[PDB]
């Protein structure tokens, strides 16, 4: 199991600094160039920095030169990224990546990726969400709808689930939307047969780790 | 720096048809150091091809890469519905650069949405804001027209839409549209309607409620 795991993301004010970590397993780490690649929300991919197996050759994109510093520790199977003087353009999901093996130079292509960690550059304050229920009506083809409205939160992300993972079918959870507030909002809905409104309870579990928010709203007919 | 232009921007194809994606570099790519990634929403990129044509380990045979110098191609001979994704090309011969990608929709038969409308909660009217939500569940194609009418007056500027990715099972979309109002303008009106017009609809569908129900 080749694994890369990033850590250290979060919300940081413009001009601030943040240190990213990526631990790696499942391969001879000290024979590999380790690489950082980022993806701003909605946009494509942009290579940030790379480092050879013994830190002899260090490479940065011009967008981050002088501001970001990369380093590794072959005794901990870990690569690091000291970010300083952070701009709005640096708001991205930061990936730690490894080349497919036997590559001719330090910067190439990347077969293995981490899950990515999200770095929000903004002076807005972390704000937990407000979870309001979307009460089921009373029917198209015998189908009813219901959900939870997750309103006004910052920064990304929030996860939503139903009956803590048990309900999966019919759920349609939507991408967050940026209000003119500057805060995010989303809905998560479920389609059900109308009759099962009496034979099951529907509890939406909303999670906002950026503020340690955990909300369990029960949705009933109004 | 080298610029990678991918064409087309979007590609909508039925299952079984063959997809042909293109990547053109502003210069020549040394030793044909060109890769193709597949990225599905919320996931990390999955390397498909590199060195123009070498398949990565574990990638199906339908994914083949061609090209040389400034013109590279990615072919997807058979298409399963699990190929709804964005496909990026990337050079590493020069700084390394990515294309902006080619979206690949999976085509299917026309499906009309079932429409639902949600009045604001009363927890939320205490808050001072009214959110009216309109749901369009599992339809195809993605093209659909949702409009809000408050006391039969068409609204403008106070709506935001949100769309799911293509379902893996039936390859449909589902759409959210949230109409945001004040507690004041919300209670100075009565009839709130959501009007949906879609290809698989003989004529627009309207779901509505009166503030007393
Ligand atoms: O320890 P070695 O054997 O080598 C030391 C290196 O400094 C050497 O390679 C150097 O000369 C050239 O590097 C090149 O030039 C830069 C000098 O610093 C390097 O840049 P970088 O430092 O940034 O390296 C970039 C890239 O080459 C690596 O990331 C990696 O992909 C290679 O594959 C790895 O190395 C094996 C040999 O090529 C491969 O074996 P391979 O079986 O092909 O791996 C397949 C892979 O699936 C599995 O290995 C993996 O899942 C589990 O491990 C891979 O393990 C290289 O590009 O020491 C050697 C070497 O110095 C010389 O042969 O004599 C020494 C005798 O011990
Ligand atoms: Zn670009």
Numbering used by the authors:
A (entry chain H): 1 to 138, 141 to 224
B (entry chain L): 1 to 94, 97 to 215
The study reports:
CPS of Hib consists of polyribosyl-ribitol-phosphate (PRP) repeating units and represents its most important virulent factor. Here we employed a Fab fragment derived from the full-length human CA4 IgG, belonging to the non-A2 family of anti-Hib mAbs, for cocrystallization studies with Hib oligosaccharide DP2 or DP3. Crystals of DP2 and DP3 oligosaccharides complexed with the human Fab CA4 were determined in the orthorhombic space group C2221 at 2.29 and 2.74 Å resolution, respectively, with a single Fab copy in the asymmetric unit. Our study demonstrates that the minimal structural epitope of Hib is comprised within two repeating units (RUs) where ribose and ribitol are directly engaged in the hmAb interaction, and the binding pocket fully accommodates two RUs without any additional involvement of a third one.
Since the analysis of the antibody binding pocket revealed the existence of potential space available to accommodate longer OS fragments, we also determined the 3D structure of the same Fab fragment complexed with the DP3 to evaluate whether longer OS may establish an increased number of interactions with the antibody and eventually engage interactions with the CA4 L chain. Surprisingly, the DP3 bound almost identically to DP2, only with the Fab H chain and involving only two RUs, suggesting that two RUs of the native Hib polysaccharide are required for optimal binding. For the DP3 OS, after the first cycles of refinement, clear electron density was visible for units A′B′-A′′B′′ and on the Rib-ol A′′′. No density appeared on the floppy Ribf B′′′ or the phosphodiester bridging Rib-ol A′′′-Ribf B′′′, likely protruding outside the antibody cleft occupied by the DP2. For completeness, both Rib-ol A′′′-Ribf B′′′ were included in the final model with zero site occupancy and not refined. Although different in length, the DP2 and DP3 oligosaccharides adopt very similar conformations when they are bound to the antibody. As a consequence of the similar binding mode of the two OS fragments, most of the interactions established by DP2 are nearly identical in complex Fab-DP3, strongly suggesting that the first two RUs represent the crucial anchoring core for Hib carbohydrate recognition. The only relevant difference between DP2 and DP3 takes place in Ribf B′, which loses its interaction with the Arg53 residue. As concerns the third RU of DP3, it extends out of the binding pocket, resulting in only one weak interaction with the antibody, i.e., a H-bond between the Rib-ol A′′′ OH-3 group and the Arg53 (CDR H2) side chain. This finding demonstrates that the third RU (especially the Ribf B′′′ group) is relatively free and mobile since it is not critical for antibody binding, explaining the diffuse electron density for this portion of the DP3 OS and the STD-NMR results.
